[PDB]
Design an enzyme around this catalytic site. Structure first.
Site, PDB file in Angstrom:
ATOM      1  NE  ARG A 496      -1.988  -1.253   3.696  1.00 22.81           N
ATOM      2  CZ  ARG A 496      -3.171  -1.534   4.240  1.00 22.81           C
ATOM      3  NH1 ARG A 496      -3.916  -0.558   4.741  1.00 22.81           N
ATOM      4  NH2 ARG A 496      -3.625  -2.784   4.266  1.00 22.81           N
ATOM      5  CB  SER A 557       9.173  -6.289   5.888  1.00 22.01           C
ATOM      6  OG  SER A 557       8.237  -6.790   4.945  1.00 22.01           O
ATOM      7  CG  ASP A 611       7.901  -5.991   8.890  1.00 22.30           C
ATOM      8  OD1 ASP A 611       9.102  -6.163   9.151  1.00 22.30           O
ATOM      9  OD2 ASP A 611       7.107  -6.948   8.711  1.00 22.30           O
TER      10      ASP A 611
HETATM   11  O1  LIG Z   1      12.311 -12.925   5.540  1.00 26.92           O
HETATM   12  C1  LIG Z   1      13.253 -12.643   6.298  1.00 26.92           C
HETATM   13  C2  LIG Z   1      14.601 -13.179   6.134  1.00 26.92           C
HETATM   14  C3  LIG Z   1      14.840 -14.321   5.516  1.00 26.92           C
HETATM   15  C4  LIG Z   1      16.192 -14.813   5.249  1.00 26.92           C
HETATM   16  C5  LIG Z   1      17.309 -14.124   5.726  1.00 26.92           C
HETATM   17  C6  LIG Z   1      18.591 -14.542   5.419  1.00 26.92           C
HETATM   18  C7  LIG Z   1      18.769 -15.647   4.609  1.00 26.92           C
HETATM   19 CL1  LIG Z   1      20.378 -16.178   4.243  1.00 26.92          CL
HETATM   20  C8  LIG Z   1      17.670 -16.322   4.104  1.00 26.92           C
HETATM   21 CL2  LIG Z   1      17.878 -17.693   3.088  1.00 26.92          CL
HETATM   22  C9  LIG Z   1      16.389 -15.902   4.402  1.00 26.92           C
HETATM   23  N1  LIG Z   1      13.134 -11.729   7.259  1.00 26.92           N
HETATM   24  C10 LIG Z   1      11.849 -11.091   7.460  1.00 26.92           C
HETATM   25  C11 LIG Z   1      12.001  -9.861   8.348  1.00 26.92           C
HETATM   26  O2  LIG Z   1      12.767  -8.905   7.638  1.00 26.92           O
HETATM   27  C12 LIG Z   1      10.642  -9.279   8.696  1.00 26.92           C
HETATM   28  O3  LIG Z   1      10.803  -8.241   9.654  1.00 26.92           O
HETATM   29  C13 LIG Z   1       9.721 -10.377   9.233  1.00 26.92           C
HETATM   30  C14 LIG Z   1       8.306  -9.912   9.476  1.00 26.92           C
HETATM   31  O4  LIG Z   1       7.762  -9.364   8.288  1.00 26.92           O
HETATM   32  O5  LIG Z   1       9.635 -11.425   8.263  1.00 26.92           O
HETATM   33  C15 LIG Z   1      10.848 -12.069   8.063  1.00 26.92           C
HETATM   34  O6  LIG Z   1      11.376 -12.581   9.240  1.00 26.92           O
HETATM   35  O1  LIG Z   2       2.934 -10.515   7.784  1.00 24.12           O
HETATM   36  P1  LIG Z   2       1.535  -9.971   7.800  1.00 24.12           P
HETATM   37  O2  LIG Z   2       0.488 -11.024   8.321  1.00 24.12           O
HETATM   38  O3  LIG Z   2       1.086  -9.340   6.439  1.00 24.12           O
HETATM   39  O4  LIG Z   2       1.568  -8.748   8.836  1.00 24.12           O
HETATM   40  C1  LIG Z   2       2.734  -7.897   8.808  1.00 24.12           C
HETATM   41  C2  LIG Z   2       2.366  -6.578   8.169  1.00 24.12           C
HETATM   42  O5  LIG Z   2       1.179  -6.114   8.836  1.00 24.12           O
HETATM   43  C3  LIG Z   2       0.684  -4.891   8.300  1.00 24.12           C
HETATM   44  O6  LIG Z   2      -0.558  -4.553   8.854  1.00 24.12           O
HETATM   45  C4  LIG Z   2       1.712  -3.789   8.557  1.00 24.12           C
HETATM   46  O7  LIG Z   2       1.224  -2.545   8.063  1.00 24.12           O
HETATM   47  C5  LIG Z   2       3.041  -4.145   7.898  1.00 24.12           C
HETATM   48  O8  LIG Z   2       4.026  -3.170   8.246  1.00 24.12           O
HETATM   49  C6  LIG Z   2       3.498  -5.556   8.288  1.00 24.12           C
HETATM   50  O9  LIG Z   2       4.548  -6.003   7.434  1.00 24.12           O
END
Ligand SMILES: O=C(/C=C/c1ccc(Cl)c(Cl)c1)N[C@@H]1[C@@H](O)[C@H](O)[C@@H](CO)O[C@@H]1O
Ligand SMILES: O=P(O)(O)OC[C@H]1O[C@@H](O)[C@H](O)[C@@H](O)[C@@H]1O
Ligand SMILES: O=C(/C=C/c1ccc(Cl)c(Cl)c1)N[C@@H]1[C@@H](O)[C@H](O)[C@@H](CO)O[C@@H]1O
Length: 867
Positions: A496, A557, A611
């Site tokens: 969004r 994120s 996020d």
């Molecule tokens: O997706 C990831 C990270 C994955 C990852 C990182 C390093 C490697 Cl080497 C690999 Cl293979 C995968 N991080 C996200 C966060 O940034 C986010 O804050 C959170 C909530 O949205 O979802 C996830 O945890």
């Molecule tokens: O991973 P979900 O279930 O979409 O929830 C996480 C997200 O929730 C949303 O409501 C937030 O605005 C985002 O910042 C956040 O990344």
């Protein structure tokens, strides 16, 4: 011609279908009164709980033991079962204070005369003639006297035991032969029946959730006067002459013990009135019990049974006409027909209950039947069947007959009770590995602490799985911040664009959601940021903002390396996205380049934030105590405000910095392995990035549903669920969505929504399966919320120690769909934090405006500092 006079004379004993519907309706009221908690103790029909919660499976197997205490035989049976096709159960038996149990109880070795089994400690089925009050499958005490089921045990010097009514034993053996049998029925010396009731309808037993067999004891229907308008002069006299006058009034007009006596008394009344025998009454006709139920069957059975009337009438010493032998015949029909029509009225009520409980437009149900009158009388069954099917036209019913009765039916209940208990400990040994103790959750908290240090340490930051990344977010909102700010929210379920319009002395909020076609998420990076900025443009126009010059905060994120507030480099795409030419690239540049190719508006990209960070700022605008942020959602992550002296990757010791923990990678170095189960290992190894994000995979995203369906498949393979039958849908990775856990655990009573889901994955499921599936989702989601809680305990307790404090009052900004839609998980996390970090008083707050609003706030704060 002689009949029509008997028909007219016994007119009140020939019951129309209209009055049988009246009776069955009356018996339903009697049914509810006995189930009801206030009404029970005054209910004539007691509606006793049996504690038989499952009919037979078909899979039962073993060597079982049991005894019939009815007192006629006093038999002791033996049976063995197997799960192959032929269902014959091998059955061999022979009939038969403190000294009182041990009298013929010497037969433990005496009924080993066959298999010499005294070396085999073996389960015992137990059927008991006299009346009792039982609180469990094994427990009871006689009223006509302390314990029994336990008292028969201390007479030992091997058993596992349950105690059951002979009507339940009948239902259960017909159930092993037909799996559709929900009703037991006895018409014999006495008469009673049992059926399978919904636990929401049984107030006398805590439960909701499930079925239990109810022993109706309908023999006592009418003891309070509800049958008086159909009862009879002859019925009153049988009652007054009885050994139990006032009790069992329905049984006495039905059972085999009273039917001969009921027609005798009718003869006497008619003889005395000149209508039979010419008034000549022998001495034996006046002697109680000489006209016996056995005789009613003979008179009605055979080709010429009008002679065997004559044969019996003379055994009682009379001078019968033929018109006398004809009358005795029809007097016999009227008694046995009224008996049959009366069991049909009270069954009509039980079948109407089961139809209601079930929801089916035509009930398909099987009645297991037993007892002298049903089997031996020539016409009783035909009239019972025919009369039921008329009173419930929307029936399809079929009756069955059990040779065993109270003998093998007591064994078959021990086979199902044993099966259940055996499959339960099997499932429970599995589920226990997902159940973590208080001590265990402290160790998790402790291990999160050292991983947090390891990442903050510039020495160890390269090997450390929890990276503790600097966000370059140092400054809370301060007093006056002015102007319009664009923000982006990317990487959630919803991309969004936001315009937050911030006044001082007041944040005006606007957004719009846009889709990103799978083709674009999976395309080139040019196509992806072209698409993003085409949405920025559609939004500016939607707002009448056109080409205005606006600063931009950006919630992104994904695992980035941030070198400064406006520069972060994508490490790997996650969630839906694989777009080429992005990983390894500054994300702000990729966005800026896509804005220039559009050649419309000037945007100043001030900040990119995770996020977590965006959520912490959103919630801190409302609550200045909010120093933390947490996502539990598609993925799980968290951030707090650290001390600059503890962030070594950024020079300088003054103040706070927010640090993106990337805490989902906790356990990538092995530190969680001894809390991980085989289902964790399996989910990890079949995932997209094996060995990465192990803690995330225990606490969130799709990974939770996958743990469930790995468990459900493990259970089914072991025959512990769905009776071993595997759906093809169930075999599909990702099919069991994490939202099912919330729907299944929010569900109660009938558990209809659980079944709806199990249907969707097309599975043939009983209502007991639904209970087991709900158990699994509750274990998994509790381990999730407890683990998340152990991490968040380490987070807040570290903030406390950093500051020297004895007590810390913190708020945690939370977001993500799993946290806010699951019924128990917020609750259980909060409890875990309060339990594992006693010195911290943590509020959680749920943003409602999304992480975008905090992107825009971080931008505004970054402007004033330069302005
Ligand atoms: O997706 C990831 C990270 C994955 C990852 C990182 C390093 C490697 Cl080497 C690999 Cl293979 C995968 N991080 C996200 C966060 O940034 C986010 O804050 C959170 C909530 O949205 O979802 C996830 O945890
Ligand atoms: O991973 P979900 O279930 O979409 O929830 C996480 C997200 O929730 C949303 O409501 C937030 O605005 C985002 O910042 C956040 O990344
Ligand atoms: O024996 C009884 C009832 C006994 C009773 C209980 C309480 C009181 Cl206060 C009194 Cl006076 C008597 N019922 C029997 C049923 O259990 C059995 O199912 C059926 C077929 O064997 O025969 C009878 O109906």
């Amino acid at each position: 011609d002689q009949v029509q006079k008997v028909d007219q004379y016994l007119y009140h004993m020939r019951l129309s279908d209209e009055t049988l519907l009246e009776i069955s309706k009356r018996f339903r009221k009697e049914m509810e009164k006995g189930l009801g908690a206030t009404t029970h103790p005054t209910a004539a029909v007691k509606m006793l709980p049996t504690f038989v919660r499952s009919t037979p499976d078909g899979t039962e197997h073993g060597e079982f033991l049991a005894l019939d205490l009815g007192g006629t035989n006093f038999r002791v049976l033996w049976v063995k079962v197997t799960d192959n096709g032929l269902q014959k159960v091998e059955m061999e038996n022979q009939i038969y204070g403190t000294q009182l149990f041990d009298h013929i109880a010497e037969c433990l070795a005496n009924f080993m005369d066959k298999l010499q089994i005294k070396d085999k400690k073996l389960p015992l089925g137990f059927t008991f003639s006299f009346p009792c009050h039982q609180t469990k499958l094994d427990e009871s005490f006689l009223v006509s006297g302390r314990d029994v089921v336990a008292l028969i045990r201390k007479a030992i010097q091997i058993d596992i035991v349950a105690v059951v009514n002979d009507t339940v034993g009948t239902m259960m053996t017909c159930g092993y032969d037909d799996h559709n049998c929900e009703i037991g029925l006895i018409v014999g010396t006495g008469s009673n029946a049992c059926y399978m009731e919904e636990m929401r309808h049984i107030d006398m037993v805590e439960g909701d959730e499930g079925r239990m067999c109810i022993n109706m004891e309908w023999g006592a229907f009418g003891d309070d006067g509800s049958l008086n308008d159909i009862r009879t002069e002859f019925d009153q006299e049988i009652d007054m002459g009885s050994l139990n006058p006032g009790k069992q009034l329905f049984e006495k007009m039905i059972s085999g013990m009273y039917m001969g006596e009921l027609v005798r008394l009718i003869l006497v009344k008619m003889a005395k009135e000149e209508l039979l025998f010419g008034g000549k009454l022998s001495p034996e006709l006046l002697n109680t019990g000489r006209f016996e139920t056995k005789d009613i069957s003979d008179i009605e059975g055979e080709k010429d049974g009008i002679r065997k009337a004559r044969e019996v009438l003379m055994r009682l010493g009379l001078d019968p006409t033929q018109e006398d032998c004809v009358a005795t015949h029809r007097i016999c029909q009227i008694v046995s027909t009224r008996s049959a029509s009366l069991c049909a009225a009270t069954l009509a009520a039980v079948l109407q209950r089961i139809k209601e409980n079930k929801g089916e437009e035509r009930l398909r149900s099987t009645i297991g039947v037993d007892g002298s009158v049903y089997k031996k009388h020539p016409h009783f069954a035909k009239r019972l069947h025919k009369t039921v099917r008329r009173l419930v036209p929307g029936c399809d019913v079929r009756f069955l007959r059990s040779e065993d009765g109270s003998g093998k039916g007591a064994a078959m209940v021990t086979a199902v009770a044993y099966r259940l208990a055996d499959q339960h400990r099997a499932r429970q040994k599995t589920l226990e590995h997902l159940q973590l103790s208080h001590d265990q959750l402290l160790e998790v908290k402790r291990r999160m602490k050292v991983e947090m240090e390891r990442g903050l340490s510039k020495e160890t930051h390269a090997s450390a799985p929890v990276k503790m990344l600097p966000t370059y977010v140092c400054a809370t909102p301060d007093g006056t911040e002015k102007g319009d700010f664009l923000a982006l929210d990317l990487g959630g379920t919803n991309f969004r664009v936001l315009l937050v319009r911030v006044r001082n002395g007041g944040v005006e909020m606007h957004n719009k959601i846009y889709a990103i076609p799978q083709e674009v998420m999976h395309g080139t990076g040019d196509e992806l940021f072209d698409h993003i900025v085409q949405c920025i443009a559609d939004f500016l126009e939607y707002m009448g903002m056109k080409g205005v010059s606006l600063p931009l905060g950006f919630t992104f994120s994904f695992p980035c390396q941030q070198n400064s507030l406006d520069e972060s480099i994508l490490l790997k795409w996650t969630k839906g996205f694989k777009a080429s030419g992005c990983e390894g690239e500054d994300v702000v540049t990729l966005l800026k380049e896509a804005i220039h190719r559009r050649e419309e508006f000037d945007l100043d990209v001030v900040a990119v934030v995770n996020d977590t960070v965006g959520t912490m700022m959103t919630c801190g605008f409302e609550d200045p105590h909010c120093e933390v942020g947490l996502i539990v959602g598609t993925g799980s992550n968290a951030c707090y405000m650290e001390e600059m002296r503890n962030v070594e990757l950024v020079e300088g010791e003054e103040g706070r910095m927010c640090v993106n923990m990337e805490w989902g990678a906790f356990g990538d170095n092995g530190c969680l392995d001894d809390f991980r189960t085989e289902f964790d290992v399996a989910v990890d190894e079949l995932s997209l990035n094996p060995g990465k994000q192990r803690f995330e995979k225990m606490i969130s995203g799709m990974y939770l549903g996958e743990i469930v369906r790995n468990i459900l498949i493990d259970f089914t393979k072991r025959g512990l669920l769905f009776r071993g039958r595997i759906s093809e849908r169930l075999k599909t990775r990702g099919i069991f969505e994490t939202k099912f856990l919330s729907q299944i655990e929010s569900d109660c009573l009938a558990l209809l929504q659980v079944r709806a889901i199990l249907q969707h994955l097309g599975l043939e499921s009983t209502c007991d399966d639904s209970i087991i599936v709900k158990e699994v989702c509750t274990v998994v989601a509790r381990r999730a919320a407890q683990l998340c809680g152990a991490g968040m305990a380490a987070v807040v307790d570290r903030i406390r120690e950093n500051r020297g404090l004895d007590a810390l009052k913190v708020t945690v900004g939370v977001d993500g769909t799993l946290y806010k839609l699951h019924p128990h998980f917020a609750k259980v996390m909060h409890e875990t934090v309060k339990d594992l970090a006693p010195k911290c008083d943590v509020s959680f707050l749920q943003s409602e405006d999304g992480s975008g609003k905090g992107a825009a706030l971080i931008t505004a704060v970054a402007c004033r500092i330069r302005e």
